[PDB]
Design a protein around this nucleic acid. Structure first.
Lengths: 77, 91, 135, 112, 252
RNA sequence: AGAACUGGUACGGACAAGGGGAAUCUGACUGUCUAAUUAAAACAUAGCAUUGCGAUGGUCAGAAAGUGAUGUUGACGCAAU
RNA sequence: GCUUGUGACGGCCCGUGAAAAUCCACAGGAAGGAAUAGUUUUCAUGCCAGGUCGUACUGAUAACCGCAGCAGGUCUCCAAG
RNA sequence: GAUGGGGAAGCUCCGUUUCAAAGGCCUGAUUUUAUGCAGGCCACCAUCGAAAGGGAAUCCGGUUAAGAUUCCGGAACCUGGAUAUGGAUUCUUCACGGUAACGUAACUGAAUGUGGAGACGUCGGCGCGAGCCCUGGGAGGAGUUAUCUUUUCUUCUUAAC
């Protein structure tokens, strides 16, 4: 579906009582004219749409991945 | 540079259709495709679309007229007859 | 001479309030830094009061005689000046330069105009102004 | 160069059978059917296309929100600004002259 | 013998009019109380080209007085009318080109068109391009009026029948030679199946009475009596004078 | 477009691709037909002229009809030549 | 550069070159409505269902029609160096 | 092409809105009214008839001995219906901004009337886009290698929404 780029609202739709599954994807991409980095994508499967949240810095990944509720069945990689 | 001597627009028909028929056709197509002045805006923007319909490109004012002329000579006096006949009703 | 006075009644031909009459509160012939032209400060109304009859009674009369005003800056080129005049001796200091922007304080301007026009609509005062224009 | 074929069952090219060839992810050229083009809505008075209104097929207009179907003017999605602007002029001035017609009539007949 | 091309046009199999692109009949507004006692304000929205007609049409809208709606009317556009013109219909209508009035309401010298044979058929006479009928005298007694038809015939009709002032646009159309066969084909592709015409002398005796013979000659007398029978009315029908008529125009 | 050189003077090298002129008879031309022996100076075509008809009509159809074709027409039109 | 789509145009006409279902919008003001909350399901989200019929292959000097697997005929999209 | 009709001994023929009183429809009644009833109402006026005419909505990857835009996976949109959750609206009770063309996800609204789309000739050139064609660098594979060729061919792709 579409893509949303806000952290705070993203957690709201995780426990929105309609999301059953979610997936996380890792990509090793390039940037600018320098050395590459670690890139990750967080995907959430809704009832009629497939939301996503791309993050190009693994620094913010830690505090978010722990914030996922245990009741959410996550397909790691 | 006058490219063609005497046939102009009707020269597109080649050599066929005689000389008088082309010439008589030639006369009408000159004013059929010509540019007329508009009575509502006064511009050189009156052209013929369809048989006897004269439209103005600007202000979209379409005037009904002759098949090949905005105002045919056989009917220019018709409104002159009516207009001269109107005033006797009042005075 | 200059007939775009501070009590003049005009009609708006451009913008959201297209076809709704207004009253000129303050004219600006020399313009300003903002709106560098002949803008005019009007206080006209957006919703016209519906027609009332002898059969109407009590609450069905009060709701019909409801008026939703508005205050807006309009250029002279979007107005239709008339010879009509509306009594505006109430609200000199209501509509002014500071009345616009920070729309929180714009609200009370739209309130005093409504009540003032509510009083002026009762009885046969300015019947033409409060009649909806057919167009 | 790869060559494509029809996906529907009609073998003839018409306005309802327009074909655009697209580069499919699988590495092959696939024919993609295009729907017929939309036409701009037109003013009822001047006939010209009116701006500010979304252009789409007729039946599909039932899904778009009103923000693309109604400008905040009088005669919103039927007339276009200038036609409305002079419609106010024609209405205001003729009624203005009508009372002028009435006042002269009340004076001439009274002095008759 | 055989049925003839003139006989075969009665069954109407392939001779029907090509009435697909024709907007509609150009009949006048039906007479009503608002018309025979007063005048109605009305305006034409656009003028359109009809198929098979050399005269432009006019789409005039008349506000229904009985009910809240609009009625469109198809009028033959008299030359000199324009879109947005106020076309007036009724007794009290002024004398201007485009208005329709009964013949009894107009003084001597006026030429009109689309007049009614009877009071209410909504116009039968002088409907082609460039035609008009002249007012050549009134008959107040027994409410008649006689007029000059475009063919020169003088006919007397009721003063109550309506007619629209002015000549019809599209006149002078036949002054242009038709030149090509295709131009004739294009003209006749929308009117009827009456083109091209094959001479009866060329064909066989079965196909036409003129047919047969070792040469291209008619045979017996070509002129056919009016009291003849269908099947042989394929020549000069009740001809009065043949050859080049001599003398000037404007005959009595 | 031009200048030198060069090739047993070969060079649109294969394919591709107008014979031309003085006239005579006749149909003006484009076009059409005897699908299975006649493509024609035959038919058709624009042009010219004549005839009938103002609808309670002119021409034509039907066994009648409260039926039709021209006609969703009007003499600069329809119909017959 | 070829195929194709689209836009503003220009030329042509005594040819100016389809209808309806359907969908939407505007004028109008009926009717109802406040805050102790009434609308808002032509705003975002959530729930359910989408019935019947066809879907294989040829489409042509062997799958169709010409008694046959008969040099005949049969509509169309893509098309490189 | 069926009714109402008119012919015809008749099989049937004419017309199909024309000499037919030809229909359903929203508000209200509710609380035996089931749906009747009391008013506002509108009048269209059988049916058939073009899997290349108009037409609401989807694609990609893969999978059979023979199927796929139909099956598997993933990702969409439309229509009919029921119900809430969230947002906007409001004691200026049915929104604001911009001078304006107009915009902001929402941002009352019937009978009736009007307007737009559907809806659209052919030819000629021009502008722009896509598919393909030509080609440089680089990352791999295959071919030649008596002699020469930083050489030849090939993969480098992205959908509906």
């Amino acid at each position: 579906a579409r893509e949303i780029t806000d952290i705070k609202q993203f957690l709201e739709l995780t426990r929105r009582a309609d999301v059953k599954t979610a997936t996380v994807k890792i990509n090793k991409k390039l940037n600018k004219a320098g050395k590459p980095f670690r890139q990750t994508k967080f995907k959430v499967r809704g009832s009629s749409s497939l939301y996503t949240l791309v993050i190009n810095d693994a620094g913010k990944a830690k505090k978010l991945i722990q914030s996922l509720p245990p009741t959410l069945k996550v397909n790691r990689l | 540079a006058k490219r063609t001597k005497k046939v102009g627009i009707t020269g597109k028909y080649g050599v066929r259709y005689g000389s008088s028929l082309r010439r008589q056709v030639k006369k009408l197509e000159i004013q059929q495709h010509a540019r007329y002045d508009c009575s509502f805006c006064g511009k050189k923007t009156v052209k013929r679309g369809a048989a006897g319909i004269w439209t103005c490109s600007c202000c979209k004012k379409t005037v009904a007229g002759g098949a090949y002329t905005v105002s045919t000579a056989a009917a220019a006096t018709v409104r002159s007859t009516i207009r001269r006949l109107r005033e006797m009703v009042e005075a | 001479a200059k007939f775009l006075k501070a009590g003049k009644v005009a009609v708006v031909v451009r913008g959201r309030y297209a076809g709704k009459k207004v009253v000129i509160v303050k004219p600006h012939d020399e313009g300003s830094k903002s709106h560098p032209f002949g803008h005019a400060l009007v206080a006209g109304i957006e919703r016209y009061p519906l027609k009332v009859t002898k059969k109407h009674g009590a609450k069905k009369v009060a709701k019909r005689t409801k008026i939703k005003p508005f205050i807006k800056v309009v250029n002279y080129n979007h107005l239709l000046p008339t010879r009509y005049t509306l009594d505006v001796e109430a609200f000199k200091s209501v509509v002014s330069t500071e009345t616009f922007e920070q729309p929180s304080q714009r609200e009370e301007a739209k309130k005093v105009v409504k009540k003032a026009f509510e009083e002026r609509h009762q009885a046969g005062k300015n019947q033409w102004f409060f009649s909806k224009l057919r167009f | 160069a790869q060559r494509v074929t029809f996906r529907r069952r009609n073998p003839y090219n018409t306005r309802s059978n327009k074909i655009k060839v697209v580069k499919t992810p699988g590495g092959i050229l696939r024919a993609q059917h295009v729907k017929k083009l939309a036409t701009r809505p037109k003013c009822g008075d001047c006939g010209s296309a009116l701006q500010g209104i979304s252009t789409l097929r007729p039946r599909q207009y039932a899904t778009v929100s009103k923000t693309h179907k109604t400008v905040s003017r009088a005669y919103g999605g039927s007339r276009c600004a200038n036609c409305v602007k002079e419609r106010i002029i024609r209405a205001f001035l003729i009624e203005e002259q009508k009372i002028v017609k009435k006042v002269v009539k009340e004076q001439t007949e009274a002095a008759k | 013998g055989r049925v003839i091309r003139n006989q075969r046009k009665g069954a109407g199999s392939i001779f029907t009019s090509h009435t697909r692109l024709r907007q509609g009949a150009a009949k006048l507004r039906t007479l009503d109380y608002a018309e025979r006692h007063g005048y109605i304000r009305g305006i034409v929205k656009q003028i359109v080209h009809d198929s098979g007609r050399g005269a432009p049409l006019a789409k005039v809208v008349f506000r229904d007085p009985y009910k809240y709606r609009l009625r469109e009317e198809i009028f033959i556009a008299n030359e000199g009318v324009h879109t947005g013109q106020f076309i007036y219909a009724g007794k009290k209508a002024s004398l201007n080109v485009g208005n329709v009035l009964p013949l009894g309401s107009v003084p001597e010298g006026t030429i009109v068109s689309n007049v009614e044979e009877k009071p209410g058929d909504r116009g039968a006479l002088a409907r082609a391009s460039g035609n008009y009928v002249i007012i050549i005298g009134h008959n107040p007694d027994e409410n008649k009026t006689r007029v000059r038809l475009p063919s020169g015939a003088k006919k007397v009709i009721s003063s109550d029948a309506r007619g629209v002032i002015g000549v019809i646009a599209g006149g002078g159309r036949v002054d242009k030679p038709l030149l090509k066969a295709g131009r004739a084909f294009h003209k006749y592709r929308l009117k009827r199946n009456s083109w091209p015409k094959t001479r009866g002398v060329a064909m066989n005796p079965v196909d036409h009475p003129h047919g047969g013979g070792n040469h291209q000659h008619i045979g017996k007398a070509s002129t056919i009596s009016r009291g003849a029978v269908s099947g042989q009315k394929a020549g000069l029908i009740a001809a009065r004078r043949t050859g080049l008529l001599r003398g000037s125009q404007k005959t009595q």
